[PDB]
Amino acid sequence: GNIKQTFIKRTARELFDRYPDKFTRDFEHNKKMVAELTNVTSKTIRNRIAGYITRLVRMKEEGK
Amino acid sequence: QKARIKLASTNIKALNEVTDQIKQIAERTGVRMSGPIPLPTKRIRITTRKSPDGEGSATFDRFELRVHKRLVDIEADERAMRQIMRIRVPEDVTIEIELI
Amino acid sequence: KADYNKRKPRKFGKGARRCMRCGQYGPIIRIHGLMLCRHCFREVAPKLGFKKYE
Amino acid sequence: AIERYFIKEGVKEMLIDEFLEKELRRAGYGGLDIKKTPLGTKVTIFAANPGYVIGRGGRRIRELTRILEKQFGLENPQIEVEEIKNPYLNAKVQAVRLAQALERGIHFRRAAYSAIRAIMRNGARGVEIRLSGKLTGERAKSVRFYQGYLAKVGNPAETLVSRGYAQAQLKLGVIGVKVSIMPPDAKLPDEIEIK
RNA sequence: UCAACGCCGGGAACCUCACCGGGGGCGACGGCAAGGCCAGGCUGAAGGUCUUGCCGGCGAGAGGAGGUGCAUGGCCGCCGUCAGCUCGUACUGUGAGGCGUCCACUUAAGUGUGGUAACGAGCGAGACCCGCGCCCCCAGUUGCCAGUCCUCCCCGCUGGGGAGGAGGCACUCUGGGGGGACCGCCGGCGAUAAGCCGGAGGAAGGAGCGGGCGACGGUAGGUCAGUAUGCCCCGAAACCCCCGGGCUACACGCGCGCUACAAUGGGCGGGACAAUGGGAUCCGACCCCGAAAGGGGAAGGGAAUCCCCUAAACCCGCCCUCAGUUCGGAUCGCGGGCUGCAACUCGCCCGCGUGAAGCUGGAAUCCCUAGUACCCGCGUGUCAUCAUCGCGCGGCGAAUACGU
Numbered sequence: 001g002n003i004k005q006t007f008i009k010r011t012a013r014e015l016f017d018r019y020p021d022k023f024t025r026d027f028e029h030n031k032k033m034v035a036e037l038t039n040v041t042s043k044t045i046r047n048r049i050a051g052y053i054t055r056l057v058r059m060k061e062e063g064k
Numbered sequence: 065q066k067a068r069i070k071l072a073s074t075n076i077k078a079l080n081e082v083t084d085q086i087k088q089i090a091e092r093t094g095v096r097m098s099g100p101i102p103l104p105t106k107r108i109r110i111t112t113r114k115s116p117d118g119e120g121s122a123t124f125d126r127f128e129l130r131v132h133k134r135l136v137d138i139e140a141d142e143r144a145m146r147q148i149m150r151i152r153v154p155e156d157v158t159i160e161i162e163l164i
Numbered sequence: 165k166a167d168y169n170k171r172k173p174r175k176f177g178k179g180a181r182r183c184m185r186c187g188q189y190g191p192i193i194r195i196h197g198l199m200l201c202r203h204c205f206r207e208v209a210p211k212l213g214f215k216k217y218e
Numbered sequence: 219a220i221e222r223y224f225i226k227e228g229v230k231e232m233l234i235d236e237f238l239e240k241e242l243r244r245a246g247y248g249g250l251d252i253k254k255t256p257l258g259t260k261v262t263i264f265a266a267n268p269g270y271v272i273g274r275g276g277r278r279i280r281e282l283t284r285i286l287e288k289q290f291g292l293e294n295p296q297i298e299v300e301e302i303k304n305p306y307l308n309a310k311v312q313a314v315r316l317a318q319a320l321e322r323g324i325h326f327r328r329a330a331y332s333a334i335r336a337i338m339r340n341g342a343r344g345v346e347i348r349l350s351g352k353l354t355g356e357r358a359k360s361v362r363f364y365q366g367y368l369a370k371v372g373n374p375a376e377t378l379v380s381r382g383y384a385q386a387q388l389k390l391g392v393i394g395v396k397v398s399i400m401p402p403d404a405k406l407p408d409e410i411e412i413k
Numbered sequence: 414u415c416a417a418c419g420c421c422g423g424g425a426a427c428c429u430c431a432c433c434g435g436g437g438g439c440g441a442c443g444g445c446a447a448g449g450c451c452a453g454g455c456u457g458a459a460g461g462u463c464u465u466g467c468c469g470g471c472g473a474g475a476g477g478a479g480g481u482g483c484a485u486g487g488c489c490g491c492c493g494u495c496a497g498c499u500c501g502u503a504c505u506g507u508g509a510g511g512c513g514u515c516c517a518c519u520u521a522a523g524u525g526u527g528g529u530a531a532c533g534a535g536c537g538a539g540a541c542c543c544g545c546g547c548c549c550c551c552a553g554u555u556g557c558c559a560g561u562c563c564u565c566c567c568c569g570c571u572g573g574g575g576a577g578g579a580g581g582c583a584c585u586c587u588g589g590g591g592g593g594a595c596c597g598c599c600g601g602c603g604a605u606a607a608g609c610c611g612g613a614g615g616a617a618g619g620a621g622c623g624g625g626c627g628a629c630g631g632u633a634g635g636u637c638a639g640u641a642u643g644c645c646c647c648g649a650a651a652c653c654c655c656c657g658g659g660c661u662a663c664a665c666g667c668g669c670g671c672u673a674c675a676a677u678g679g680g681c682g683g684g685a686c687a688a689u690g691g692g693a694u695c696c697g698a699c700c701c702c703g704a705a706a707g708g709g710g711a712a713g714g715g716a717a718u719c720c721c722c723u724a725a726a727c728c729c730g731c732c733c734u735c736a737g738u739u740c741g742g743a744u745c746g747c748g749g750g751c752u753g754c755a756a757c758u759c760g761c762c763c764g765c766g767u768g769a770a771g772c773u774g775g776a777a778u779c780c781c782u783a784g785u786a787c788c789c790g791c792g793u794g795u796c797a798u799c800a801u802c803g804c805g806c807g808g809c810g811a812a813u814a815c816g817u
């Protein structure tokens with residue numbers, strides 16, 4: 001199942017709450033920003049967080 | 065005449081410790097050193113049954129003891145021997161020296 | 165006159181290998197000089213350094 | 219061979235550890251560290267009450283230094299006794315203390331609540347105690363007390379949690395005591411801190 | 414019953430042993446000499462007890478492979494790698510209790526998205542740990558040999574092909590660190606969400622693949638014959654040590670397997686090609702004996718250096734041509750060997766003979782979705798000797814469905 005965990009989604013939303021412009025619509029840029037901002041030593045967790053942030057940026061820039 | 069040193073251990077951090085110690089020992093002075101060279105890791109495997117009785121489906125525990133192995137050659141100079149043999153080895157590492 | 169209570173010096177057979185901990189006779193792992201039973205080894209393995217690693 | 223000597227020394231170490239855990243059950247036995255040296259093999263014995271070991275008499279230390287060589291075959295061995303700090307975070311010392319309390323005749327619910335309070339007061343995130351046996355009547359039962367956070371299963375379980383087991387030999391059977399503690403400087407993988 | 418029946422790691426010659434037939438030993442501590450030996454008797458054999466002499470100066474208790482797994486602990490199987498078990502405040506109920514934990518969609522998942530007298534937390538799931546697969550950096554021996562150089566050998570046609578040594582580490586391999594995959598991009602579905610189905614490039618796609626860790630509880634599930642342990646019991650013994658037997662006895666019923674009923678083959682002679690693991694009175698190359706099993710010397714190896722180790726199925730040619738057979742091997746006779754103190758009861762191997770059922774199998778029932786199943790053979794555990802077994806390793810390699 002490709003279901004994002006509650007803490008993944010929550011940390012993504014919390015990092016989009018502030019630092020709202022450090023992120024963009026590029027998975028690699030979001031990877032870099034995540035690794036710079038938070039202390040996560042799991043590539044999979046970090047990549048899932050970055051993907052969720054990407055989807056959030058898309059949803060925001062398009063509206064809802 | 066050259067000296068070979070073999071390191072064996074279960075912990076990799078102690079191995080890296082001793083190897084980097086001797087690496088600095090050999091870089092301070094100008095001496096030719098090869099390695100450290102990694103040898104194949106050796107595993108003692110033991111499979112056994114869990115239940116102390118005969119009833120019930122059979123289930124097995126597989127235990128393993130791993131041993132990592134490094135090799136080093138030091139060129140066997142007097143200063144090198146002097147300032148190498150004086151390194152406290154962590155008890156979780158075995159080290160054996162000998163000249164070719 | 166006092167020797168009818170002592171065993172014989174076996175070199176081979178199941179009566180030549182007791183466990184260093186319990187005293188069982190039959191099942192001895194006997195790998196790499198381990199004179200332990202399959203019941204005590206499974207309990208003292210971590211103390212010796214074995215792990216699962218599967 | 220190298221590995222044969224390795225494993226045999228390990229096994230003898232385990233045997234000596236068991237013997238000492240059985241003999242020094244009062245002082246509070248925490249662990250052992252044997253170091254061989256040309257200076258002379260030495261045995262570091264951890265304890266929370268070195269009085270029961272070397273208190274106003276060296277009879278015990280002499281007897282131990284003689285037994286370690288007459289029974290387990292240790293060459294020119296000496297013994298150093300060391301004190302343990304943070305005994306309220308070791309799950310073996312506490313298990314044995316709880317067992318001795320039960321043996322004294324003190325009620326098990328009261329004793330367990332007291333131990334939980336004492337372990338919570340001196341720094342910890344989680345404690346679980348399980349008692350089993352003939353607590354009340356002829357039929358056996360199990361009882362469980364808990365407080366805080368724990369990690370029952372997984373690699374962080376197998377690593378960051380301290381565990382202990384003990385037997386209480388009472389007038390009418392055996393009671394099993396199992397204790398598990400989590401230290402205060404432990405952090406689980408699923409907790410991530412933000413800048 | 415699943416969840417007993419190649420299970421108790423249970424492949425038992427002695428030991429193991431707990432069974433049978435015999436023999437001999439065992440009383441710390443408390444109170445009112447012990448012992449030991451040449452010769453010959455008794456004896457299966459025994460200074461075990463006797464002839465001969467001579468040296469020497471009653472409670473209670475240990476132990477118990479004895480009883481109770483329905484007095485316990487500890488550890489294991491099955492509900493179940495199922496998705497469940499709870500708490501704080503508030504609210505509805507006189508109350509036991511309820512709600513949250515419900516509805517719709519979704520997910521491997523009490524996994525999530527929306528709606529809701531509920532709002533928020535915890536243990537379990539996931540995260541976590543190991544290995545496989547693609548790439549980069551470091552390292553170059555005991556691992557590798559491509560291009561370079563210098564010798565030696567041989568063929569056909571001077572074109573080629575081999576073996577060493579110098580010397581390299583390039584390729585392979587080994588092992589430390591690091592990157593890489595995230596439904597991320599483009600479409601349709603779902604509702605605009607949570608998500609689902611397809612294309613792209615890619616080593617690898619949709620928790621990449623395969624494993625370990627298995628929750629609150631409950632089963633009077635199994636184990637006191639792995640160790641620990643209450644109660645009862647034997648304590649001259651049910652304690653523990655030898656010597657011989659048995660667990661291997663066989664009109665029969667059953668489970669799990671091996672070999673077969675032949676041509677999708679049997680035999681003879683030639684030609685190929687692995688991986689995992691292990692190794693001190695251990696592995697043993699190499700040489701010589703012997704038809705074979707095996708025997709005598711003996712290098713090297715404490716194992717990236719030496720050894721176990723040129724695996725079988727497979728390919729080529731010849732004989733057999735549908736037959737109880739050149740199919741099949743049971744059973745039995747004679748002889749030769751190895752281990753062991755001891756091979757009759759009761760061990761394994763070799764040669765020449767002998768040549769039993771078996772012609773594809775009723776009712777019924779079992780395992781399997783990818784390098785998986787079928788087929789083929791090796792390692793290791795048990796081991797002095799003994800594998801139709803367990804745990805693992807590789808070789809060759811499918812058919813169907815993407816459902817209910």
Ligand SMILES: [Zn+2]
Nearest residue numbers: 183186201204
């Ligand atoms: Zn044992």
